[PDB]
Enzyme design. Structure first.
Site, PDB file in Angstrom:
ATOM      1  N   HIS A   1      -4.498  -0.934   0.031  1.00  0.00           N
ATOM      2  CA  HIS A   1      -4.375  -0.826  -1.434  1.00  0.00           C
ATOM      3  C   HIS A   1      -3.828   0.538  -1.796  1.00  0.00           C
ATOM      4  O   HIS A   1      -4.120   1.544  -1.143  1.00  0.00           O
ATOM      5  CB  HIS A   1      -5.712  -1.058  -2.163  1.00  0.00           C
ATOM      6  CG  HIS A   1      -6.143  -2.483  -2.195  1.00  0.00           C
ATOM      7  ND1 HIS A   1      -5.429  -3.438  -2.899  1.00  0.00           N
ATOM      8  CD2 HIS A   1      -7.207  -3.077  -1.614  1.00  0.00           C
ATOM      9  CE1 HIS A   1      -6.074  -4.575  -2.714  1.00  0.00           C
ATOM     10  NE2 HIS A   1      -7.145  -4.404  -1.945  1.00  0.00           N
TER      11      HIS A   1
ATOM     12  N   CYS B   1      -0.390  -2.307  -1.729  1.00  0.00           N
ATOM     13  CA  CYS B   1      -0.716  -3.365  -2.656  1.00  0.00           C
ATOM     14  C   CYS B   1      -1.172  -2.609  -3.899  1.00  0.00           C
ATOM     15  O   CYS B   1      -2.277  -2.066  -3.904  1.00  0.00           O
ATOM     16  CB  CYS B   1      -1.828  -4.234  -2.069  1.00  0.00           C
ATOM     17  SG  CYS B   1      -2.083  -5.795  -2.944  1.00  0.00           S
TER      18      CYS B   1
END
Ligand SMILES: CO[C@H](c1c(NC(=O)Nc2cnc(-n3nccn3)c(Cl)c2)cnc2cc(Cl)nn12)[C@@H](C)OC
EC number: 3.4.22.-
Length: 358
Positions: A76, A125
């Protein structure tokens, strides 16, 4: 190249954020590809903030004059007022910068180095240092293979071009074109390339002679000792059952343990050796240990690489181990015409495996 040094971090199992699937295959396959190119690779899965910071600091420290470095992060990512951040597995929800690693700070420290080449690749992400910065934002986008494993969009195209003896900037531009043709990322800002490369440098460039530069040999010895696996052992139990303990490595901080019965006396109808009571720091859940297949543990790389009819346990937090890896081998056995299960147990010390040596 004075040396070829790489650090690959893949964050998947987040406490307060959606879990990712692609980093596992991406990190593993990029590790093999870079190993082929003579890079000394450290590959780490599911790192916390403090672990990420120390790993990055130590990698940055290796970036001496003429060294070729490569840093890869899959996981992430967070964007806040022109700054991008890498999200560790222990990050609270909502995201906050103090818990994350600032990309701009890393780039700033990279800029001070006299590296021959410095490649910084993010797969998130959402005098010259010769920095090539690749920033991919299509990570949760992934493709399912015939293997059933999740491969990232960025890595799919990167795998196919990495081994090419061509300038890195040219290589990365072809990967950006491939993603642009890919239906999932077609007319979208999926990869941004920033480069300060004035010289034709490639990941395929050779390492400086060991007949005059001994720093590659010192760093090779230091890398080697951080990748040591325990030798397989045989334990004999009072009942006559002999158990084998086997060890395999997936990443610098991920090790698979397997147990198998080498000898079962005729008097014993059924027996199984279960590995238990691992150090607390490792955070192993007993419902994810002693599985009938390596796939059930979350180990998909190294699968038909391991003996059949074993019990498998994945130790994916080896960087947390601050003492020797002391655990228990519990034998559960049954005599054909007897009441129930008889238990016997013995402690085992396998030292500090892999990254735990450092
Ligand atoms: C300088 O050491 C080498 C090194 C790295 N060092 C680290 O990763 N250090 C690290 C330190 N602390 C933690 N940590 N654990 C609990 C809390 N903090 C962790 Cl997760 C990682 C990183 N990148 C490369 C690439 C190559 Cl080649 N070597 N290398 C090597 C010998 O390391 C294997």
């Amino acid at each position: 190249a004075k040396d070829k040094v790489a650090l690959l971090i893949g964050n998947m199992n987040y406490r307060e954020h959606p879990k990712l699937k692609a980093p596992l295959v991406d990190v593993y396959e990029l590790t093999n590809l870079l190993r082929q190119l003579d890079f000394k690779v450290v590959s780490l899965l599911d790192l916390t903030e403090y672990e990420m910071r120390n790993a990055v600091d130590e990698f940055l420290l290796l970036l001496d004059k003429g060294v070729y470095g490569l840093l890869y992060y899959a996981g992430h990512g967070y964007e806040n007022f022109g700054n991008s951040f890498m999200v560790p597995v222990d990050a609270p929800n909502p995201y906050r910068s103090e818990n994350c690693l600032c990309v701009q700070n890393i780039l700033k420290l990279m800029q001070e180095k006299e590296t021959g080449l410095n490649v910084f690749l993010l797969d998130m992400c959402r005098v010259t240092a010769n920095i090539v910065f690749g920033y991919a934002t299509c990570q949760e986008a992934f493709e399912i293979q015939h293997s059933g494993l999740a491969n990232g969009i960025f890595m799919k195209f990167l795998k196919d071009r990495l081994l090419e003896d061509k300038k890195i900037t040219v290589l990365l531009d072809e990967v950006a074109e491939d993603m642009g043709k890919c239906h999932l990322t077609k007319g979208k800002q999926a990869l941004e390339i920033r480069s300060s490369l004035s010289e034709k440098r490639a990941l395929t460039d050779p390492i400086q002679g060991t007949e005059y530069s001994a720093e590659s040999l010192v760093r090779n010895l230091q890398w080697a000792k951080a990748h040591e696996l325990p030798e397989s052992m045989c334990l004999k139990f009072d009942c006559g059952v002999q158990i084998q303990l086997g060890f395999a490595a997936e990443f610098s901080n991920v090790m698979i343990i397997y147990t198998s019965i080498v000898y079962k006396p005729p008097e014993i109808i059924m027996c199984d050796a279960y590995v238990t009571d691992f150090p607390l720091d490792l955070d192993i859940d007993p419902k994810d240990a002693n599985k009938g297949t390596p796939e059930e543990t979350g180990s998909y790389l190294v699968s038909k690489d391991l003996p059949k009819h074993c019990l498998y346990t994945r130790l994916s937090s080896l960087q947390k181990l601050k003492e020797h890896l002391v655990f228990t081998v519990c034998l559960s056995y049954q005599y054909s015409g007897l009441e129930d299960t008889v238990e016997d147990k013995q402690e085992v010390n396998v030292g500090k495996p892999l990254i735990a040596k450092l």
